[PDB]
Design an enzyme around this catalytic site. Sequence first.
Site, PDB file in Angstrom:
ATOM      1  N   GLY A 101       0.870  -1.293  -0.139  1.00 57.57           N
ATOM      2  CA  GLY A 101       0.057   0.029  -0.080  1.00 57.57           C
ATOM      3  C   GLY A 101       0.721   1.368  -0.042  1.00 57.57           C
ATOM      4  CB  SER A 102       0.430   4.461  -1.318  1.00 56.28           C
ATOM      5  OG  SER A 102       1.146   3.938  -2.411  1.00 56.28           O
ATOM      6  N   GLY A 103       0.275   4.342   2.346  1.00 61.05           N
ATOM      7  CA  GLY A 103      -0.295   5.078   3.602  1.00 61.05           C
ATOM      8  C   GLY A 103       0.546   6.529   3.466  1.00 61.05           C
TER       9      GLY A 103
ATOM     10  CD  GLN B  30       4.340  10.199   5.734  1.00 61.78           C
ATOM     11  OE1 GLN B  30       5.437  10.410   6.392  1.00 61.78           O
ATOM     12  NE2 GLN B  30       4.109   8.892   5.669  1.00 61.78           N
ATOM     13  N   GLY B  31       4.686   7.949   1.759  1.00 64.28           N
ATOM     14  CA  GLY B  31       5.294   6.813   1.086  1.00 64.28           C
ATOM     15  C   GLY B  31       4.677   5.512   0.571  1.00 64.28           C
ATOM     16  CB  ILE B  32       5.399   2.974  -1.774  1.00 65.09           C
ATOM     17  CG1 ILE B  32       7.025   3.054  -1.790  1.00 65.09           C
ATOM     18  CG2 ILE B  32       4.946   4.249  -2.526  1.00 65.09           C
ATOM     19  CD1 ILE B  32       7.288   2.779  -3.018  1.00 65.09           C
ATOM     20  CB  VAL B  33       3.730   0.473   3.009  1.00 63.77           C
ATOM     21  CG1 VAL B  33       3.996  -0.522   4.113  1.00 63.77           C
ATOM     22  CG2 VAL B  33       3.758   1.764   3.663  1.00 63.77           C
TER      23      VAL B  33
ATOM     24  CG  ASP C  73      -4.932  12.069   8.033  1.00 68.92           C
ATOM     25  OD1 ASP C  73      -6.100  12.158   7.453  1.00 68.92           O
ATOM     26  OD2 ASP C  73      -3.951  11.397   7.705  1.00 68.92           O
TER      27      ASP C  73
END
EC number: 2.7.11.24
Lengths: 347, 11
Positions: free
Chosen positions: A27-29, A31-34, A145
Site C-alpha cells: 500500500g501507499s500510506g 507519504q510513502g509506499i509500503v 487524520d
Amino acid sequence: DNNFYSVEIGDSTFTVLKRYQNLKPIGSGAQGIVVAAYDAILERNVAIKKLSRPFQNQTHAKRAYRELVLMKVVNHKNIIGLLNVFTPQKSLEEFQDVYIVMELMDANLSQVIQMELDHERMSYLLYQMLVGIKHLHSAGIIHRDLKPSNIVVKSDATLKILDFGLARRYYRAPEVILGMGYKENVDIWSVGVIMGEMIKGGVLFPGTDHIDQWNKVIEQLGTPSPEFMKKLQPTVRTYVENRPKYAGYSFEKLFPDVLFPADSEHNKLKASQARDLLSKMLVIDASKRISVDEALQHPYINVWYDPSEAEAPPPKIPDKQLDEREHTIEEWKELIYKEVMDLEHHH
Amino acid sequence: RPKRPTTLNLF
C-alpha cells in the site's frame, strides 16, 4: 558483502538490510509506499515504509520529521510498533531515503466496516481507538487524520493506529476543514464518523466528491447553530451561511435498530447506548462534542476500561522540537539525517 | 463481566 541490497518492485527500488526478504507491495500510506517482508533474523513478517528524498520540500520534511520523532518516542499497545529504521546511503552527503520497519497487522478498518460485528467487537475496537488516541493526546499530540485506512486490526481483535505524518475527506473534523482552530477532541469527530460507518456498513455521508461530503453532512446532522457560524472566518462563514438550512434527523432515525446487531447479554452494550455515544461524538460544533475521557467514561465503552491501558505515562517529546518553525531544504535534510542516524541500530 | 473478544474474522 555490503549489508544492503536492492529489489525492484515494479518501478520502485527498495534498498534494505539483507535480513528483509521476499518483499510484496502492500500500500501507499500517505507519504510513502509500503511493503510487506519476511525478516529472517526475527523470523517474522514486518512492513517497511519507504520515504523517498523526504527532504525535497517544506510539507514532506515536516511530516517525515514528525513521523520519525514520534515513532521513536511513542510506544503503546494500540499505536503501531516500531522495529527498525535505516538508510542505505553512507553519509549526509549521499543521503536520500529513509526506511521505517514496523509490525505487520492483518487488515485495516475499511475491512471491518464491511463486516457484521457484534456489540462486544465494535465496542472493544472503539475502546482500543480511544485508548490509543488518549495516549497521544496525553503528550499534546493531536492526530487530525484518523480514518479507516490508517487504523489496523489483527485476527486476535487487537487494533493499532498508524501515522502521525499529519499529527501535530469527511473523516477530518469540520473545525479542521474550515481553518477554524482546534483542540484535542478534533479526533473524536473522526471516531464518530468511523463508528457510524461501522454501524451503517459503508460510507456515512455518500458523495460523489470531497466537498459533497459537507452538504450531505449538514443535510444529515442539521445546520449548525448561529454562535457556531459566528466563530468562522468572516469569508468562509458566508460560504457556509449560504447553503440551504436543514433540521437534520434524530439519531434514532439516522441509526435505527435494524442497523445494529442483537443487543447483547450485557446491560450497557445495546443499540440505545451506542446511539447515545454516537450522538455525542458525531457533533459538528467541537465545543459541544465530547472529549476522549468522557467517551472512555461512557457506558458503551467503559466496560473494558483499564487504567493501566488508559492512564500510561505520557510519551515525552523534547518540545525543543515544537517544529512549527519553517526551515530550509538544506537544514531539513540535516535534521532528518541526525534523526535517522540516532535511530539506526539493528541490521 | 464481558470477556474481551479474542478473534476477528478477516478472511
